Write a protein that binds this ligand. Structure first.
Ligand SMILES: Nc1ncnc2c1ncn2[C@@H]1O[C@H](COP(=O)(O)OP(=O)(O)OP(=O)(O)O)[C@@H](O)[C@H]1O
Ligand SMILES: [Ca+2]
Ligand SMILES: [Ca+2]
Ligand SMILES: [Ca+2]
Ligand SMILES: [Ca+2]
Ligand SMILES: [Ca+2]
Ligand SMILES: [Ca+2]
Lengths: 197, 356
């Protein structure tokens, strides 16, 4: 373990006192002077790969660009890379990433009226409250992880059609799985009414 | 908290640094009467407005409407006070110096941001893949770019452009689904075409064999169910649509496909570094999301590459938003606060400090 290694942990570079072991879930910056290695674990996350690459260029431009950056895929290391260390090995260590899933409080939810006069379909934001759901239109409740299509008792078939489709596009935009729920006026579950503040 | 806005030709991506996904995504469209309507409302109000794209091929062209995009990003979609947050912007390949001083000036004088930074989309996606060196294929809504990057720096002389991307594929898919006997005129019906594009289309490994397979059976046909229980049935259109990326002639474009523009981009770099680009082809952008595209690229660049050259195509799982996620990491890293441009320096050096 002659070369200086920086282990990626939670958006910072911690330099190890004894390099050599490499965790499959993590990323490392191997600094060996004029050669700089990005060791990228096959199960590492995007924040870890990113800091490794950005830090390398910073290290390289720190040394007037003379250094040579290479990338090593973990688990397919070249023999000359492994011999850099007294006894190199692979482990299953995985420091969790920094990036968080977005979470919305109920008061951040947004309610939207879907009304078609005869020519065109309107999509408007309305005050976030049960007292905004009018029986004549369709209302789309954006609850981040959940999308509710509320069909008033007197909505047009096409307002229910269109409102359903723009719910599908909410789910297409957003990472992960969003549950779209078609609910009828007078049949809406407890969980829907809770999505208002 | 910092804010990350990735301004694209068809879609604005915006959210908070530290988030793993952008929470605001809306069309980069502004509609004025035949005083302004922005984003989804602009699209929805299609029958009575003129829709303009302020960004064309990743470069900003209509400044007035761009501020309405940014105004709409801050006040309507994220509902934040720009005076409260350092804001990270992104920029296209070959973005002229003047455009980006103008991005800076507008940020500080119109939106009074405390600090800002402009990062290059291709490098963000490359870093996000775990690379300092590679050739990025960036296929978005309005433009496809081949961006060779050597150890953190794009090579401007070798950058290739294909005036073709997701919006032409949507339009082409609409055209050939019409030839099946369907109609797509209203706003909801146009979203169905684009929803079908993003869910059932794919790039075939060998096109003409896929056409034969589609002709000799209904093996590859797939059905898209509409809210009212109707079904839209699609056969060789699943792969004819994204095939356009490899055969631009499908939409009447006399251009080389994306595999050829990748090869052409590498070939314009010095012989010393082509070995590193052939082995680090990184996909980014919404249109690099079709299943089958990497395997197809691998086969096609292998057919054009020198013998014994090692070819690798990397298609990271998050490439739909890889620019924005990269910027989310950057603006959220302790090590990067150094190069935040504060309002103080802009007061002294003017907009010209951004290049430095
Ligand atoms: N699963 C998918 N399959 C195919 N295409 C998709 C998918 N998801 C999104 N797209 C397309 O990607 C495009 C948007 O991608 P992106 O945000 O990267 O482009 P942009 O940044 O707006 O434009 P550009 O990069 O050309 O300036 C849209 O056309 C969208 O239809
Ligand atoms: Ca990890
Ligand atoms: Ca160097
Ligand atoms: Ca109605
Ligand atoms: Ca989803
Ligand atoms: Ca883009
Ligand atoms: Ca949206």
């Amino acid at each position: 373990r002659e070369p200086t290694v920086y282990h990626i942990q939670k958006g910072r570079l911690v330099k190890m006192k004894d390099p050599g072991a490499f965790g499959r879930g993590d990323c490392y910056l191997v600094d060996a002077g004029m050669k700089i290695y990005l060791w990228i674990g096959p199960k590492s996350t995007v924040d870890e790969k990113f800091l490794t690459a950005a830090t390398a260029v910073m290290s390289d431009q720190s040394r007037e660009g003379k250094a040579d950056i290479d990338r090593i895929d973990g688990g397919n290391e070249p023999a000359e890379f492994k011999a850099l260390f007294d006894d190199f090995c692979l482990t299953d260590e995985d420091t969790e990433g920094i990036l968080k899933k977005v979470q919305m409080e109920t008061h951040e939810h947004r309610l939207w009226r879907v009304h078609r006069e005869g020519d065109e379909t309107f999509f408007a934001e309305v005050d976030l409250n049960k007292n905004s759901l009018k029986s004549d239109d369709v209302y789309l409740l954006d609850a981040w992880d959940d999308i509710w299509v509320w069909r008033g008792k007197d909505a047009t078939a096409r307002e229910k059609f269109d409102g359903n489709i723009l719910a599908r596009r909410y789910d297409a935009e957003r990472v992960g799985v969003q549950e779209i729920e078609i609910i009828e006026e007078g049949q809406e579950p407890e969980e829907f009414f809770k999505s208002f503040p | 908290t910092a804010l990350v806005c990735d301004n694209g030709s068809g879609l604005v991506k915006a959210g908070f640094a530290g988030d793993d996904a952008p929470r605001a995504v809306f069309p980069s469209i502004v509609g004025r009467p035949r005083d302004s309507y922005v984003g989804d409302e602009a699209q929805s109000k299609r029958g009575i407005l003129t829709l303009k794209y302020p960004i064309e091929h990743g470069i900003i062209t209509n400044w007035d409407d761009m501020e309405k995009i940014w105004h709409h990003t801050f006040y309507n979609e994220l509902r934040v006070a720009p005076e409260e947050h350092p804001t990270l912007l992104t920029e296209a390949p070959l973005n002229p110096k003047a455009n980006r001083e103008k991005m800076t000036q507008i940020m500080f004088e119109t939106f009074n941001v405390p600090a800002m930074y402009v990062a290059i989309q291709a490098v963000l996606s490359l870093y996000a893949s775990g690379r300092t060196t590679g050739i990025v294929l960036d296929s978005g809504d309005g433009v496809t770019h081949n961006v060779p990057i050597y150890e953190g720096y794009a090579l401007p002389h070798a950058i290739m452009r294909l005036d073709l991307a997701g919006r032409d594929l949507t339009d082409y898919l609409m055209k050939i689904l019409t030839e099946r006997g369907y109609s797509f005129v209203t706003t909801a019906e146009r979203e169905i075409v684009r929803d079908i594009k993003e869910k059932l289309c794919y790039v075939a490994l060998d096109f003409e064999n896929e056409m034969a397979t589609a002709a000799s059976s209904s093996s590859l046909e797939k059905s898209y169910e509409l809210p009212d229980g109707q079904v839209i049935t699609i056969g060789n259109e699943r792969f004819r649509c994204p095939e356009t990326l490899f055969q631009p002639s499908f939409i009447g474009m006399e251009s080389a496909g994306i595999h050829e523009t990748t090869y052409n981009s590498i070939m314009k770099c010095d012989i010393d570094i082509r070995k590193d680009l052939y082995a680090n082809n990184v996909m980014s952008g919404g249109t690099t999301m079709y299943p089958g595209i990497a395997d197809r690229m691998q086969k096609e660049i292998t057919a054009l590459a020198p013998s014994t050259m090692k070819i690798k195509i990397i298609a990271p799982p998050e490439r739909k938003y890889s620019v924005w996620i990269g910027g989310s990491i950057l603006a959220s890293l302790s090590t990067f606060q150094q190069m935040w441009i504060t309002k103080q320096e802009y007061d002294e050096a003017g907009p010209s400090i951004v290049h430095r």
